Amino acid sequence: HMKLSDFIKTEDFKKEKHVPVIEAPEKVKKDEKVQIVVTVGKEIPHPNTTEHHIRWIKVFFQPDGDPYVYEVGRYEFNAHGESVQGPNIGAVYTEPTVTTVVKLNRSGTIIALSYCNIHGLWESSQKITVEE
Template sequence: MDIYKCKHCDEAWDKIFEGTACEEAGCACEDMTQLEEKTADFKNEKHVPFVEKSENGIKVIVGKAALHPMVTDHWITMIEVIDGSMVYRKYLNPGDAPEAEFPIHNVNVKAREYCNKHGLWANQ
């Protein structure tokens, strides 16, 4: 479940298989850079996703002491949970809360989020 960022169009992409699908969108695949998951906050910016039990499964919150901003020029675009071979994802928009609930009862999952300014973050 690698995520890449295109240097040509500045979009983030899942790379599901090897191929040249982004040529149709005007991108050059050789300009894709694999994003590294960051796991520790820098400068107190509150990017690490935290997992907690909820009534219907688990809840992932971005920023434990202070929630991540969700404004037009700085927001969490997606939150995902990887539980074995299953991947659950929720896309967010500016103005949404930086959180997502998933119907999983395992709290020991890998949670990731993508910040449009600061990249890819994970809890482990």
């Protein structure tokens, strides 16, 4: 009985900085380009230092009535002030927010998963309706 799920946390993003917050329309037209914004640290900011940072956000789509989830994408945030001069002396920091664009032809659920280098995995989800 060792499951990854035991170590995927969810919380109210109002209480917890680590929760990825999905911003996506509630209902869209079939095949139109939909913008999905996912942010970690939306209400409570999360640190972005060489030692402590959000590594990535991943988005999944679960089509209603489908048995599976589909990986929409993985969005890696890879600069956190590292330098040959020392940690946090670098020129560039990648913030844990991403806008991805999808085309859907069926209603389903958007699932966001994020990973902190020291605080593990965090998730949220939001239903999305598709129409002609």
